[PDB]
Design a protein around this ligand. Structure first.
Ligand SMILES: [Mg+2]
Ligand SMILES: [Zn+2]
Ligand SMILES: [Zn+2]
Ligand SMILES: [Zn+2]
Ligand SMILES: [Zn+2]
Lengths: 240, 65, 77, 254, 35, 115, 98, 192, 98, 526, 44
RNA sequence: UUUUGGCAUAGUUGC
């Protein structure tokens, strides 16, 4: 009945207006990666080659996007569609016509999601702001999303089979919005309890407890090897 | 299913030892004695023969096609 | 006769940067000297630091009135 | 600012393994040699399988995967071979591969064991090592397995079937004089086979000026190469890698 | 005559083996359907 | 399906430099050597050899990601000795060491075989 | 003829009843397959046992959510006939009545 | 990054030896459990002879239950304290608990000394059988093991009755997990 | 057709009376491991019913000693309602009291 | 009770309860009652004597079976209602021996306490050394492991099947597993597992794996999918027929090549296929003729293993095509001990990169230490120690739950006899630098199970795909595709962020942008 | 096309028009013969 | 010359 079409969780209102299926979304299992910054996310090459973002053709990027067009959708990184200014769409799976591969300024090119693209990243059930945060895409060559370990606490995630969702903002306005509001560093301190939500967890916490003991001493080779992994290091080896 | 060719851990050849292993068990060897007689020192290799199940024998009861 | 805060809010910064990056992506004239810059967002943030973005924020008070603030007038926090 | 003067003492040499000791060397060099033993000594292993007919209970990928792990005598022939992708041939030739053919029809009322003996090479110097023999599959009456294959040069870094070693035992400082490891109760720990301590002792006295030297090796060969040949080819390959890096660095500096 | 404590561990598992040789594991289903 | 081909850990695809040198501006006489399609096999040994040079003030290496086959070696020397020169000297010393070890290992095999 | 009854596998009317392991392999049937299930349109269907309250037994409860201090029910059911089981409550009214 | 690379040199593990205690510690724990069980017997026989008098505001059953509960809680805390004192500085279990990375002190005591009392609905194991928790006990048995006090550690292994009572205890935590998942966000989705 | 339908769908009762038909009695037999098949064949189901409203059936009861596995229940919304027989447990098949 | 024990007029399954205090004797004979057999105790002595055990040892060629024990009046079935009136001994060797008297009126005795467990709980080694939720979780996971689900799997055509290449019986086993046929149909591999923190990819219940072991077939498996299809002729208006269709005789076809199919509309077994390829070329007559051929699942890829053709119950020709896909373990795939230690493959390292003992034994698997302390799966550690002892001894270890003959101290002494540290720890060397690791790693064999949840069946992504026909929103096609529900909780999250433009982007132009014409005077659509 | 009977292994030719049945056993299950296209595996 | 699709009941399973 028309009542049942609207009533309940699955009606039009709660099922199709307050929440709905969305394009430019992906899902897969999560695995750890301590080699990523907390604001980065590993992405499989398949998802990145499948999802796309619209770059507006500009003379600063005319040659780069022309190269991405000539690569086509077949190869990663590449592009799927050229949206000319008339609204007509050229599908770069089926058109070796070079005439259609010309790019005038103001055209859009649905290029494959490349490194550094901003993505909202989510785990359900979504219980607070830190359950949906913006990450920078990093392409990695296996079929799992990768997270820094510290961000597993805000998502309440663990790599025991948990899956996570990835939404790609599709225009510069929303992309800037996520970049300035919902990125992971901006979500360190919650307004819930005026404290950090990300901390040092598991191996790193046990290891730092062992490390800062009074009786830990490091030979010079060990020190230099560790200082290799310090991004903010000024290059000056301190006095022993 | 059938005996693996290599020990998974150390990569020692263990596929040519299943029949001999069974033969030594028909000689009333203890299973440790049989594995020693076949020269399997690392317990990674000993695990292979000691825990293998030769299911292919059960599969050869069914007719071919 | 303005009562709103002189500080640009986080949401104002977000929308201003997104809108200006879209404009720059649409071949809008750039109001700051840029070097080796291709991404519109970096150019927009350079304009924001330079306080050269040509946008006026219209803040609506909860009585049907408004205040118009030049982006250069607000404090970029 | 110069090389060590490393010295070798072979304590045992058989057809299955070589046990030796390297003194006057850095830990990094010794570990790199131990690592090259596993990952960078090239051997010959089956890497291309065309199955013309399979009726065994095992599907085709199972038979191919089992065939890849068959070790092949590649003592001297591997050096004069080339990597297939480097070879200019039309995909295969006696200068980049060794052809094998297997054709076994179980036309009898007894389970026919298809072993490594049935693998027939076109080159006498490259045979299965056991040629008791490695069982590939077992066949019922009326089951045929007929395939050809090609075995090519590769090293264990690409895939473990090109690994020549069957376990590389590596050790240093057996009495823990350097305290690179800290026993909570050193009494409980059995002595290494290279320990020089009497049984009333559990741990050598701490050496504040010590440095890791006298690394003990026991390289066991799977059978594709003699262990002497494994170690010599390992050192040659590591020297070749360093010389190639030297060439590329000289080009980059210039 | 009587099962000694040391031999009990073997004895009980002999009994359980005889049980599962007799009844099997899905005796509930088969007996119910036969009835 | 996203599994990389196994050969992309020791093979250079076209348009890839094996080794690249970049000056480090934070500290004088400091260089970063980015070597593609290598791992701890060469990184650890080159670092250990460089540490034996007295004129080397710092020598370290890292793998930036285990799934990516770069090694970055940072070398800083005294200000009379280029890091590039130190790197070349370290490789030549390692090659001399390994050739000597090959020779002595062949002699040891011959003595053990003879008895 | 009145119909066709599905047969639970390896029951005493299945054709695999009391066959040797060699015979089961001759029929391409796993000798370790326990049976105990039906085949409906080729799909292997298993009947899950369903628990329910035992019948013909007096059970005295205390309904915390009613005007009865105690209720003595008995789900009475005939001796393998007339599957509709007639349940009869005998309830003592709560003394806090109107 | 820095500390994960140092941990390749340090290394961190956990094994059986991190769950073993000294023989003196085991003897002390066993003496504590012997004493606690004997005091529970003293409380039982004083109740049976009517020599137990109810506390103000409690019936005699609540008085008795609080007495045995506090005896067994005292025993559990004393055993846990002794177990934690036996730990060496090299004990990896303690190394994990002290950093706050995982576990806590009660987990160490349960693994090493005594799993402790099992509770369903916040009381001891009820007489599901006719005046019995299980058919292996006499009727009207309020002893600790009879009512679901696990006296072994997880290392020592649980007895059959103790295993079943621990399963009964864990079933509650599973049910509360399911109920929380049912009420995950319902209160929230009305609040928003 | 009625027996085939009821075992095919697991709805029990008349097909036209599917509204009041207890569902999920017959399930597709699970074939992932031999253990999964065996556990599925030895499975018991607790329907919710009005009885479930009265006394909490989820929590493990003492009388399940030796009859039902104390540590095998599906996680999620079916905890403690779907059970598995203990190994030596056997269900009485019924005979005549005459 | 005398008559029931003699199998006289009263059959065995009849239950008799005497409520003494209420003066009642209730006899139950109906079906549905659940019982279990218990040994009968009389005068503090078992009625099971050694002669019964001797006759049962030679159970073959004697025909002295369980039914003769029941007929001997030694063991009888007891139900819960009768258990209410039973004083039961947990075990004869202690409970009914003389003592300070606890009870001297035992009526029955348990055969073995371990028979309280079910099928999937009886494969757990040392379950009495675990927190019980972990036993529950393993009971859940053991149903999901990979193994050999049935011996005749070759002839079967199930919709989904998983077959592990090299199953092994557990090195540490239970006596109950003897009767589950688990020795004959195992599900899992004994793997040399080390419990160590390492490069950092095993944290939070993840797992580092040995790449070279995987290259040697470790946990390699096969996934079979059978696609059935039946042509049907409804009178003569529609006539579905198997045949390879062509662009010039059908009015709509996919660009997927139909050259895979033979000239009956059926692909042959042995052809490599991919997610878009057609496997059964079927076409239905147009009232030219539109195709209704079937394709693979879009994510899947494999080799056509077997193609069978029959006639259905009606008599219409119909076929079933089993497609084989070899699953190698990779990053993301699940693995679990028999203790609830669930975890995904974090990263795979070659043999040279794994840590190694002084004997060159690299671990197959490295699991995080922190998986242990909160979970308290001490049975995992005891299994690893017993596995090491059993693998060295050339024996299969025993891990029945309630067995005092097995004790961790005895296992430690036995292990010390084999020249290992008594607690299973070992001095491991760092794979990269070759340096000794400062702490000594707990390591040994342990039975692990490869669960069916591979990542390649769970990965998907949506962008501009097949929307619904009613709602114009993304929809779940023949795959995981069709986008993810940006549910209410996600909308509230983005409202809390204040990301209004992104929220509009998700809920309006990323799902179903649309525009209408509305009259300004009457607000109804125009 | 050639099909193999599922009970007596007889290779028999069948057209796309006739009902399938073993021509010396009457059996009603037939299996397609293995493809003659070359199939190649790397032994990894 | 460039396609498109059942749905809405029940069950099971994952976090
Ligand atoms: Mg999880
Ligand atoms: Zn081995
Ligand atoms: Zn060639
Ligand atoms: Zn109008
Ligand atoms: Zn026939």
């Amino acid at each position: 009945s028309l009542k049942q079409r609207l009533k309940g969780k699955e009606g039009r209102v709660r099922g199709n207006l307050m929440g709905k299926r969305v394009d430019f979304s992906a899902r897969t299992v999560i695995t750890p990666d301590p080699n990523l910054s907390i604001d980065q996310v590993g992405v499989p090459r398949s998802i990145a080659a499948n999802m796309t973002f619209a770059e507006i053709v500009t003379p600063f990027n005319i040659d780069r996007l022309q190269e991405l067009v000539r690569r086509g959708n077949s190869q990663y990184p590449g592009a799927k569609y050229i949206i000319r200014d008339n609204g007509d769409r050229i599908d770069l799976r089926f058109h070796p016509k070079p005439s259609d591969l010309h790019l005038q300024t103001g055209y859009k090119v649905e290029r494959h999601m490349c490194d550094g693209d901003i993505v909202i990243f989510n785990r359900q059930p979504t219980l607070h702001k830190m359950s949906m945060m913006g990450h920078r895409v990093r392409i990695l060559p296996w079929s799992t999303f990768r997270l820094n370990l510290s961000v597993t606490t805000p998502y309440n995630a663990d790599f025991d089979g948990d899956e996570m969702n990835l939404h790609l903002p599709q225009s510069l306005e929303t992309r800037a919005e996520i970049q300035e509001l919902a990125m992971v560093p901006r979500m360190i301190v919650t307004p819930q309890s005026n404290r950090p939500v990300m901390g040092i967890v598991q191996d790193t916490l046990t290891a730092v407890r062992k490390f800062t003991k009074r009786d830990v001493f490091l030979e010079r080779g060990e020190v230099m090897n560790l200082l290799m992994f310090l991004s903010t290091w000024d290059g000056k080896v301190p006095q022993p | 299913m059938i005996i693996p060719v290599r020990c998974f851990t150390c990569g020692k050849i263990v596929g040519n030892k299943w029949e001999a292993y069974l033969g030594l068990l028909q000689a009333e060897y203890t299973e440790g004695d049989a594995l020693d007689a076949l020269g399997l020192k690392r317990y990674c290799c000993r695990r292979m023969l000691l825990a293998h199940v030769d299911l292919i024998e059960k599969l050869l009861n069914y007719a071919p096609l | 006769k303005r009562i709103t805060t002189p500080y640009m809010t986080k949401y104002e910064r977000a929308r201003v940067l997104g809108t200006r990056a879209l404009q720059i992506a649409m071949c809008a004239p750039v109001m700051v000297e840029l070097e080796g810059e291709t991404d519109p967002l970096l150019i927009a943030m350079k304009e924001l630091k330079a306080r050269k973005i040509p946008i006026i924020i219209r803040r609506y008070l909860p009585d049907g009135s408004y205040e118009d603030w030049g982006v250069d007038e607000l404090i970029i926090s | 600012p110069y090389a060590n003067q490393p010295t070798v003492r072979i304590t045992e040499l058989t057809d299955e393994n070589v046990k030796f000791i390297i003194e006057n060397t850095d830990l990094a060099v010794a570990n790199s040699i131990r690592r090259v033993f596993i990952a960078e000594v090239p051997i010959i292993a089956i890497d291309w399988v065309q199955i013309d007919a399979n009726s065994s209970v095992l599907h085709d990928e199972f038979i191919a995967h089992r065939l890849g792990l068959i070790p092949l005598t590649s003592d001297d022939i591997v050096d004069k071979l080339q990597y297939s992708r480097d070879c200019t041939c039309e995909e295969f030739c006696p200068e980049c591969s060794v052809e094998f053919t297997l054709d076994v029809r179980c036309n009898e009322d007894q389970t026919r064991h298809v072993t490594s003996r049935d693998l027939i090479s076109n080159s006498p110097r490259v045979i299965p090592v056991t040629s008791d023999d490695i069982l590939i599959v077992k066949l019922r009456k009326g089951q045929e397995l007929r395939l050809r294959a090609y075995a090519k040069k590769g090293f264990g870094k690409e895939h473990a079937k090109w690994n020549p070693t069957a376990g590389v035992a590596f050790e240093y400082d057996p009495d823990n004089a350097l305290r690179h490891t800290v026993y909570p109760k050193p009494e409980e720990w059995p002595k290494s086979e290279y320990s020089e301590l009497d049984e009333d002792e559990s741990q050598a006295p701490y050496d504040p000026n010590g440095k890791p030297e006298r690394f003990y090796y026991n390289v066991e060969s799977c059978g594709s190469l003699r262990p002497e040949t494994i170690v010599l080819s390992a050192l040659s390959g590591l020297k070749k890698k360093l010389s190639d890096l030297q060439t590329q660095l000289s080009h980059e500096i210039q | 005559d009587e099962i000694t404590p040391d031999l009990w561990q073997e004895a009980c598992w002999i009994v359980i083996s005889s049980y599962f040789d007799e009844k099997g594991l899905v005796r509930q289903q088969l007996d119910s359907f036969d009835e | 399906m996203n599994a990389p081909p196994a050969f992309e850990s020791f093979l250079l695809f076209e348009g890839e430099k094996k080794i690249t040198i970049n000056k480090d501006t934070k500290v004088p006489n400091a260089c970063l050597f980015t070597i593609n399609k290598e791992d701890h096999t060469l990184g650890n040994i080159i670092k250990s050899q460089l540490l034996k040079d007295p004129q080397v003030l710092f020598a370290g290496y890292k793998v930036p990601h285990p799934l990516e086959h770069k090694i970055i070696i940072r070398v800083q020397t005294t200000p009379d000795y280029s890091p590039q020169e130190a790197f070349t000297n370290a490789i030549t010393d390692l090659i001399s060491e390994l050739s000597l070890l090959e020779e002595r290992f062949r002699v040891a095999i011959k003595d053990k075989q003879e008895g | 003829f009145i119909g066709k009854i599905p047969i639970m596998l390896r029951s005493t009317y299945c054709l695999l009843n009391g066959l040797t392991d060699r015979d089961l392999c001759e029929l391409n049937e796993c000798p370790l397959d326990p049976g105990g299930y039906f085949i409906i349109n080729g799909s292997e269907k298993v009947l899950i046992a369903q628990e329910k309250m035992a019948t013909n037994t007096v059970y005295v409860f205390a309904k915390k959510d009613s005007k009865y201090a105690y209720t003595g029910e008995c789900r009475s059911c005939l001796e393998n006939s007339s599957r509709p089981t007639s349940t009869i409550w005998v309830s003592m009214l709560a003394r806090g009545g109107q | 990054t820095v500390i994960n690379n140092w941990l390749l040199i340090e290394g961190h593990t956990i094994g059986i030896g991190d769950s073993i205690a000294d023989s003196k510690t085991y003897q002390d724990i066993q003496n504590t459990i012997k004493k606690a069980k004997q005091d529970v017997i003293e409380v039982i026989e004083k109740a049976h002879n009517n020599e137990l008098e109810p506390t103000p505001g409690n019936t005699l059953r609540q008085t008795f239950e609080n007495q045995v509960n506090r005896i067994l809680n005292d025993a559990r805390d004393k055993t846990g304290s002794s177990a934690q004192k036996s730990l060496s500085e090299y004990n990896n279990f303690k190394s994990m608990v002290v950093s706050g990375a995982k576990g806590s002190k009660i987990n160490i005591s349960q693994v090493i000394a005594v799993v402790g009392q099992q509770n369903v609905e916040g009381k001891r194991i009820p007489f599901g059988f006719k005046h019995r928790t299980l058919p292996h006990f006499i009727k009207d048995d309020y002893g600790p093991e009879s009512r679901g006090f696990v006296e072994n550690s997880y290392l020592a292994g649980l007895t059959p009755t103790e295993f079943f009572f621990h399963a009964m205890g864990g079933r509650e935590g599973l049910i509360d997990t399911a109920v929380k998942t049912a009420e995950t966000g319902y209160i929230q989705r009305r609040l928003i | 057709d009625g027996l085939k339908y009821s075992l095919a769908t697991g709805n029990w009762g008349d097909q036209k009376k599917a509204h009041q038909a207890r569902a999920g009695v017959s399930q597709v037999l699970n074939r992932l491991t031999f253990a999964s098949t065996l556990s599925h064949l030895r499975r018991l189901n607790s329907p919710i019913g009005r009885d479930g409203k009265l006394a909490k059936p989820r929590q493990l009861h003492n009388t399940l000693w030796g009859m039902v596995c104390p540590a095998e229940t599906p996680e999620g919304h079916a905890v403690g309602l779907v059970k598995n027989l203990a190994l030596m447990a056997y269900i009485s098949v019924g005979s005549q009291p005459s | 009770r005398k008559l029931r024990r003699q199998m006289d007029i009263i059959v065995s399954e009849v239950s008799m309860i005497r409520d003494i205090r209420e003066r009642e004797i209730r006899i139950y004979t109906d079906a549905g009652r659940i019982c279990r057999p218990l040994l009968i105790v009389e005068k503090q002595k078992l009625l099971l004597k050694k002669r019964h055990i001797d006759q049962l040892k030679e159970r073959e060629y004697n025909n002295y079976s369980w039914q003769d024990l029941v007929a001997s009046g030694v063991v009888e079935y007891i139900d819960t209602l009768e258990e209410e009136t039973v004083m039961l001994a947990m075990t004869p060797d202690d409970l009914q021996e003389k003592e300070v008297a606890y009870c001297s009126t035992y009526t029955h005795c348990e055969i073995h306490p371990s028979m309280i467990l079910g099928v999937c709980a009886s494969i757990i080694p040392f379950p009495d050394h675990n927190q019980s939720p972990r036993n529950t979780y393993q009971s859940a996971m053991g149903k999901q492991a990979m193994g050999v689900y049935i011996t005749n799997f070759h002839v079967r055509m199930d919709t989904l099947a998983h077959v592990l290449y090299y199953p092994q019986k557990p090195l540490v086993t239970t006596r109950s597993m003897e009767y589950l046929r688990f020795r004959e149909l195992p599900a899992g591999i004994n793997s040399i597992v080390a419990i160590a923190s390492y490069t950092g990819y095993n944290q939070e219940d993840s797992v580092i794996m040995n790449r070279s072991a995987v290259d040697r077939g470790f946990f390699r498996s096969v996934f079979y999918r059978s696609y059935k299809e039946q042509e049907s002729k409804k009178g003569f208006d529609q006539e579905e027929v198997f045949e390879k269709p062509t662009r010039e005789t059908c009015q709509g076809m996919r660009h997927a090549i139909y050259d895979k199919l033979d000239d009956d509309g059926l692909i042959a077994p042995g052809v490599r296929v991919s997610g878009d390829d057609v496997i059964i070329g079927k076409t239905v007559t147009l009232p030219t003729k539109r195709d209704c051929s079937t394709f693979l699942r879009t994510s899947e890829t494999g080799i056509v293993d077997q193609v069978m053709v029959t006639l259905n119950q009606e008599g219409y020709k119909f076929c079933k095509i089993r497609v084989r896909s070899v699953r190698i373990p990779q990053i993301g795939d699940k693995f679990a001990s028999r203790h609830g230690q669930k975890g995904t493959c974090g990263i795979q390292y070659r043999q040279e990169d794994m840590p190694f003992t002084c004997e060159g034994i690299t671990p197959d698997i490295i699991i995080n230490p922190h998986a242990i302390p909160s979970r308290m799966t001490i049975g995992h550690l005891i299994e690893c120690l017993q596995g090491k002892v059993s693998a060295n001894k050339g024996e299969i270890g025993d891990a029945t739950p309630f067995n005092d003959a097995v004790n961790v101290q005895k296992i430690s002494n036995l292990l010390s006899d084999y020249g290992y540290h008594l607690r299973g720890n070992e001095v491991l060397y760092n794979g990269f630098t070759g340096r000794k690791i400062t702490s000594q790693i707990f390591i040994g064999p342990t039975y692990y199970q490869r669960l069916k949840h591979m990542v390649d069946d769970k990965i998907h992504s949506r962008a501009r795909g097949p929307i619904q026909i009613l709602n114009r929103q993304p929809m779940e096609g023949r795959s995981r595709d069709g986008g993810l529900r940006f549910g209410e909780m996600e909308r509230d999250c983005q409202i809390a962020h204040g990301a209004a433009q992104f929220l509009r982007e998700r809920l309006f132009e990323a799902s179903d942008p649309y525009q209408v014409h509305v009259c300004n005077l009457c607000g109804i659509m125009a | 096309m050639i099909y193999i009977c599922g009970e007596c292994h007889t290779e028999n030719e069948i057209k796309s028009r006739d009902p399938i049945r073993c021509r010396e056993c009457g059996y009603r299950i037939m299996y397609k013969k293995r493809t003659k296209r070359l199939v190649v595996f790397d032994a990894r």
